[PDB]
Design a protein around this ligand. Sequence first.
Ligand SMILES: CN(C)CCCS(=O)(=O)N1CCN(c2ccc(Br)c(NC(=O)c3coc(N)n3)c2)CC1
Ligand SMILES: CN(C)CCCS(=O)(=O)N1CCN(c2ccc(Br)c(NC(=O)c3coc(N)n3)c2)CC1
Ligand SMILES: CN(C)CCCS(=O)(=O)N1CCN(c2ccc(Br)c(NC(=O)c3coc(N)n3)c2)CC1
Ligand SMILES: Nc1c(C(=O)N[C@@H](CC(=O)O)C(=O)O)ncn1[C@@H]1O[C@H](COP(=O)(O)O)[C@@H](O)[C@H]1O
Ligand SMILES: Nc1c(C(=O)N[C@@H](CC(=O)O)C(=O)O)ncn1[C@@H]1O[C@H](COP(=O)(O)O)[C@@H](O)[C@H]1O
Ligand SMILES: Nc1c(C(=O)N[C@@H](CC(=O)O)C(=O)O)ncn1[C@@H]1O[C@H](COP(=O)(O)O)[C@@H](O)[C@H]1O
Lengths: 419, 419, 419
Amino acid sequence: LNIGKKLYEGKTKEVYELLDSPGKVLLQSKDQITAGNAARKNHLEGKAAISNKITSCIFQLLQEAGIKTAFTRKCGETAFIAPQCEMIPIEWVCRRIATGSFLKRNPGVKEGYKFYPPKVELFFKDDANNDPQWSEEQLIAAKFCFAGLLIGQTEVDIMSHATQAIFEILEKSWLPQNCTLVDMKIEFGVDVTTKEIVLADVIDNDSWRLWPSGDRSQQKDKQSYRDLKEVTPEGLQMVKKNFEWVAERVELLLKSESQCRVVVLMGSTSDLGHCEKIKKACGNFGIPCELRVTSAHKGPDETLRIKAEYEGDGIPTVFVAVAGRSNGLGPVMSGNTAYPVISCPPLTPDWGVQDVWSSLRLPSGLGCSTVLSPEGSAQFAAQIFGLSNHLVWSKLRASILNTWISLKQADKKIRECNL
Amino acid sequence: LNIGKKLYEGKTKEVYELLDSPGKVLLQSKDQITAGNAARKNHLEGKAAISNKITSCIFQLLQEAGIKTAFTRKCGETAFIAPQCEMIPIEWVCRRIATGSFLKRNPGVKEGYKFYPPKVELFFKDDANNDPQWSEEQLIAAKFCFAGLLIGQTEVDIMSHATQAIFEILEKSWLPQNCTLVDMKIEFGVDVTTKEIVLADVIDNDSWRLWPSGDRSQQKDKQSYRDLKEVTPEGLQMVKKNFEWVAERVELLLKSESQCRVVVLMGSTSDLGHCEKIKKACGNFGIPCELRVTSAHKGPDETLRIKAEYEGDGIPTVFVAVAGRSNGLGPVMSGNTAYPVISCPPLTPDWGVQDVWSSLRLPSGLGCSTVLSPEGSAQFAAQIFGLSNHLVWSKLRASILNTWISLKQADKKIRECNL
Amino acid sequence: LNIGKKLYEGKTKEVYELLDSPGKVLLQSKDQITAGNAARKNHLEGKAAISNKITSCIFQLLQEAGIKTAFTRKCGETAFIAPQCEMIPIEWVCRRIATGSFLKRNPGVKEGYKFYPPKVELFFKDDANNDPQWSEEQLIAAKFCFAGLLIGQTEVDIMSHATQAIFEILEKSWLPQNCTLVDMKIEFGVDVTTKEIVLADVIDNDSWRLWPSGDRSQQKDKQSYRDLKEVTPEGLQMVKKNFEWVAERVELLLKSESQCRVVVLMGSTSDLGHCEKIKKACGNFGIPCELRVTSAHKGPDETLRIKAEYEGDGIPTVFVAVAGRSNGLGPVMSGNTAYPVISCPPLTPDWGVQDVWSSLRLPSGLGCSTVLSPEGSAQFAAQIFGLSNHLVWSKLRASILNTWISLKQADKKIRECNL
Ligand SMILES: CN(C)CCCS(=O)(=O)N1CCN(c2ccc(Br)c(NC(=O)c3coc(N)n3)c2)CC1
Ligand SMILES: CN(C)CCCS(=O)(=O)N1CCN(c2ccc(Br)c(NC(=O)c3coc(N)n3)c2)CC1
Ligand SMILES: CN(C)CCCS(=O)(=O)N1CCN(c2ccc(Br)c(NC(=O)c3coc(N)n3)c2)CC1
Ligand SMILES: Nc1c(C(=O)N[C@@H](CC(=O)O)C(=O)O)ncn1[C@@H]1O[C@H](COP(=O)(O)O)[C@@H](O)[C@H]1O
Ligand SMILES: Nc1c(C(=O)N[C@@H](CC(=O)O)C(=O)O)ncn1[C@@H]1O[C@H](COP(=O)(O)O)[C@@H](O)[C@H]1O
Ligand SMILES: Nc1c(C(=O)N[C@@H](CC(=O)O)C(=O)O)ncn1[C@@H]1O[C@H](COP(=O)(O)O)[C@@H](O)[C@H]1O
C-alpha cells in the first residue's frame, strides 16, 4: 500500500494521498480522544480501531441503503480508503430529543422535548469562536466554492434534507437494540472526481448521543467522557468500555432482523416479462422474490397447494397476483390467506380500462389491494417489509431522498434554459 | 363453587356439573400422567396445576382469535369453567412434520417430511381397539348424534377445516419462542346450550409435540415420557422439568410481541362517517387506530408535519388516506413516507367510476396501493401487521375459517329449499 | 411382424421388443385368468382375444379424447403395438361406489356409499406383501426413477388427477349402455422415447367393475370369477359368458350416439377469418361446423329461411352469430329459434367496448348468450353437445386435464428460476 503525503492532520485522524490510486485517500484514526477546544487530549488504547470500525459499519450501511457516501473499503483495523473530498466546513446537526446545546440556545425548553420532524441545525467550523450556529441564509450568502461547486440555494437545501434522511436511517437502524439515537453531527464534502456532494469525514462514537432503553444515565457515546468532573486513569476505563459496547453492537446494524419474501403468482407463462420486472424491482430492495405459474380458473386446487408451501415455512411473505382479464387469481388468493395479497394485473391500454375492475371490486371478507405499476408493487411490498426490517426501510427512505435530489438537479439544469 | 355430580372421570381429569350454574361444567385436572393402553401410568406432583394453566392460556388465545371454544374462565390452580358439551369421540390430529404414528402407518416416509398444507387425520376413540384411524367416509357413515346434531358431510368438513386453522394459529403463536409445533390432537364436542361444534376437552403438554430450535432431542412435550425404556424416579424429574419449562412460557403466547397502529388521514370532516367504519374494523383486529384531518390541496405543509409525528415515535404504522374527488392526499403521503399508504376513497355510484383513476395511476417512485372497501382497508392493514404480530395473524386466520363455516351452514339451510 | 426378446412375462400377458421398430413393443394377451396371490389360476378359451379387443377399444377411445396413452394399433386377434414404457409400480384405483377392499379398510362404510368427487387410492405392486395401499407421501418419499424421470410432487399429482379423468371418461362412456362403472385400476408408465407419463399396461374386464342397471348381482367384470367359493367347469362358463357380453358391447363406446352441428352465421364476408377460427375449433371437438352469409339488417327474410333449413332436418344445432357493430343478427336469430344462439362478435380494441352492449342487453323472450372468445364459442357449443354426446364430453374432460398438466410442467420449469 503506497502511502503519499499528509493532506490534513487532525486531533484524532490523518488523511493521506494514495500514490497508487488516482483521486483516492486513506483516513487513519489515532488513539486519541478530546472535548471541545479544551485540555482533554487523552491517549486511549484501541480507540483508533473502534472509531475506524464504526465509521466502516455506518458508511457501508448508509451506502448499501443508497446514500451517496465517500467510502470504498476498510484498510486494516484503523484506517479506510475513500474517494478524495474537498470538505465543506459545516457541522450538520440532527436531533430527535432536545438536549445539550439546544437547551442553552433555547432557555425554557426542557430536556426530552421531541422534534417531529427531526430538527436540523448548521454550525460553521471554527474553534477560535467555539463553532457558531449559522442560518441557511448565512451559508447561501457566503458563496463557498469547493472542487468548483458553488454552495447555493440548491446545495444547502440538499445537504439539509440529507442530514435528516441520514439521521432517520441510523435512528431506525439502532431501534432493534432498544437504543434511542438522540442526535448526531455529520460533515459533507465534494467528491473531487464526480463533483457530487457526499457524506464524508466520519460517523463514530464521537459523532452522536446513544441511550439504551432511552435512559440518559446509560449513555454509551462520548458524552460519558465530556461529563467527567475530572478525568482519571480509572475514569477513562468506564469511557473505554462504553466505546467497546458500541463497537461490538454496531456490526448488528448490518444484520437483517426479519426474513422477507415476495411470491409472484402468474396465471400464464406469457405474463413472464411483466413478472421479470417485479423480480428485478424486488432485487433493488434486497428482497428474495420467487415466480410461480398457477391459474385460479384452470388449476385452483394447485393455487391453494402452492399458497400452502409459502404460508407454512414460517417465512414472512407477500403474494403478488399477476392476472390479466378476469383476475380470479387475486380474489382466490386474498380470500384463502392471512398474508397480504397485491393484485398487479399486466394491463395494456387496449382493455386495461375494463379489466382493472376485476381487481378493485371484490365481495367484503377480502383485503386484496391493487397496484398497477410492477415496480410499484415491489416498492409497496418493500414498504410492508419496511415495518419489520430496517435494511428495507433504509433503502426506501434513501430512495425518497435521492428522488428529491434528482428533481432539485433537473430543476437547476432547466432553470438555466430561462436565463 | 357449588359442585354437583361427576359426569365423567378420565385418566387425567374429571368433569363435574355445577348445581348453581345451569348448562356449565367444571374440568378438574389430576396429578396423573399416562401413555398407551399399557401399565404406563404415574402420579406426578404439580402436573394438575401445569396442565390446567396451559389449557387456560391456549383456550383464551384461540378464543381471543375468534375460534368457537368451550371456555368460560380459570377456576383456581387446577380447574376451569366451560359450557357443557357432548364430546364427539374423534381425536383430530394435525401435523406439520411426519413423526410417530405417521411413520408406522406410512413405511418409506422419513422422519422430517414437511406437510404443505398441514396433514389432518381422524382417530376413533377406543383404548380397546388401540385408537384406530378413521376416514371422513367412516365418520359420515357412522350417522353419529350429539345434543341432537347429526354428524354429516357439513359437520365433518367443518371439524376437519377447523383442526387445520387451530394448528396453524398455535404453530404461528409458538414461533416467537423458537418453538416448532410438530403436531397436535384436539377433541371437538357439541355445546348442549348453542348446538354449535366447539373445540373442547383440553390442549396441554399431552396434546402436542414441541421442539425448541426445531430439535427433536430437546422435545419438551409428553413424548419425553412416552419414550423412556423404563420410568425411574430420576426419569420422571426430567419429564416434570420439561412440563415446568412449557408452563413458564405458555403465558407469553398471549402477549403482543410488536406495536401496531393505523393512522387514517381524512381531507374533510364530512368524510368522518367513512373513517369511523375503518376505526371500528381496526378495533375488530385489536389494532389501535387514530383519525386526523389534513388536506394535501389546502394544507400540504401540515400533511407532512402530521406524517412526521407518527413516523418519529418508531411505532410501526399503516397510513390510510381517505380523500374523494382528486385524491391528492394518497399520492403526497405515498411519495414522502417509507411506511405503507392505502388510499380508501369514499367513492359513490355518481362520480366513483371517474375519481378512482386519481388513486390508481401515479408516477413511479410511489408505492401507493388502492382498496375501495372501508372494512377491507382495515383488513389489509391487519394482513400487513399479520407478518410481524401473531395475535393479529390469528384473528385473520380464524376469520377465514368462520367465514368458511358461515357459508357451509347457509348452504345447508338453503339446500332444504331443494326438497 | 419381427418378434425380438421377451422383456416381461406376466400372469396374463407378455411384452416383446420389435426388432424392426425401435422403441416400440408388442403386448400379447394369454388365455389365462387369475385372482389374488392364492392358487386361483385357470386356462380360459378365447380370453386372450376378448382382453386384447377391449384394451384396444378403450385405449383408442381415451386416445381420441386426448389422454396421453401408450397405444399405436391392434395387431391381430390377441396383441397390440405400443411405444415402450418403464412401468411405474403403482396400481392407481378410482371408485364411484364403495365396495370390495374400500369396505375392508373402512369398517362402518356401507356397500353403496357414493364418492363426490370419485375417490382415488394408490397401491404399491407386490404379490409378496399382498398389494399394500400407499399414500402420495410414501410415493414422493420413495424417490422412484423410470426412463430418467424422478417421480416427485409434480408427477404424483399428475398421475392422481389423471386417474380421476380417465375414470370419469370411461364412466360417462358406459352410461348409454345402462352400465354403472363402479371402479377401476390402471397403471402408468414413462414412454422411454418422449419421457412423458402415459396410461400403459391394459384396461380390460380384469381392470374394472361393471354393473348393468347398477345391479351388483348382474356384475359382468372379473368379480364374478373372484367370488366363486369353488371354480367348476360350469362355473367358468358363466365367467366366460360375462366376458363375451362385455367384448360385444365395448365397440359401441367408440360410436357417437347423437348428431352434433354448429352453424356459424356471418353478416359480412370480411368476418370470414374470425369464422374460420370457430370452424377449426369445432373440428378439434369433432363437431361438424357450417359457415353461411346472411344479414339481419339487409336480408332478414333470408336470415329466417336459412335458420329454417337447419331447424327442419332435426339434427341438434347450435347457432353462432358473428356480427360486429350493432349485432342485430344474434337478437333476430335468438328471438325466432328454440335452438341455442351464441353471439360471438369480432370486437377490436377501437369500438369493442361500445358494440358489446348490442349483444348483452336484449328485451325478455330472448335467450341469446354472449361469448367474446372465438375458440371459447366453439368450446361452449361443445359443452352443450357434451350433455348428450359422450365423445364430445370426453374431449372436454380430457382438455381440462391436459391444460392442468401443462400448468403443472410450466410451474416446474420456471420454479428452477428460483435457485
Ligand atoms: C484548493 N484545493 C483544490 C486544494 C486542495 C487542498 S487538499 O488536497 O490538500 N485537501 C484534501 C482534502 N482534505 C481533507 C481534510 C479532512 C478530511 Br476528513 C478529508 N476527508 C476526506 O477526504 C474524506 C473522503 O471521504 C471521507 N469519508 N472523508 C479531506 C483537506 C486537504
Ligand atoms: C344421558 N345422556 C344424555 C348423556 C349424558 C351423560 S353426561 O351429559 O352427563 N356427560 C358425559 C360426559 N361428557 C363429557 C365427557 C368428557 C369431557 Br372432556 C367433557 N367435556 C366438556 O363437556 C367440555 C366442554 O368444554 C370443555 N372445555 N369441556 C364432557 C359430558 C357430560
Ligand atoms: C435394463 N433396464 C434399463 C430395464 C430394462 C428392462 S426392460 O426395459 O426390457 N422391460 C421391463 C418390463 N417393462 C414392461 C413390463 C410390463 C409392461 Br405391461 C410393460 N408395458 C409397456 O411397456 C407398455 C407401454 O404401453 C403399453 N400399452 N404397455 C413394460 C418394460 C420393458
Ligand atoms: N460530536 C459533536 C461535535 C464535536 O465537534 N465534538 C467534540 C469536539 C471534537 O471532536 O473536536 C467534543 O465533544 O468536544 N459537535 C457536535 N457533535 C455532536 O452533535 C450533536 C450535537 O450536540 P450539541 O452540541 O448540541 O450538544 C451531538 O451529537 C454531539 O456529540
Ligand atoms: N397426545 C396424543 C394422544 C393421546 O391420546 N395421548 C395420551 C392420552 C392421555 O393420557 O390423555 C396417550 O394415551 O398417550 N393421541 C394422540 N396425541 C397426540 O397426537 C399427535 C400425533 O401423534 P401420533 O398419533 O403419531 O402418536 C401427538 O401430538 C400426540 O401427542
Ligand atoms: N383388477 C384389479 C386388481 C388386480 O390386481 N387384479 C388381478 C391381477 C391380474 O390377474 O392381472 C388380481 O390379482 O385379482 N387390483 C385391483 N383391481 C381392480 O381395482 C378395483 C378396486 O377394487 P379393490 O382394490 O377394492 O379390490 C376393482 O376394479 C378391481 O378389479
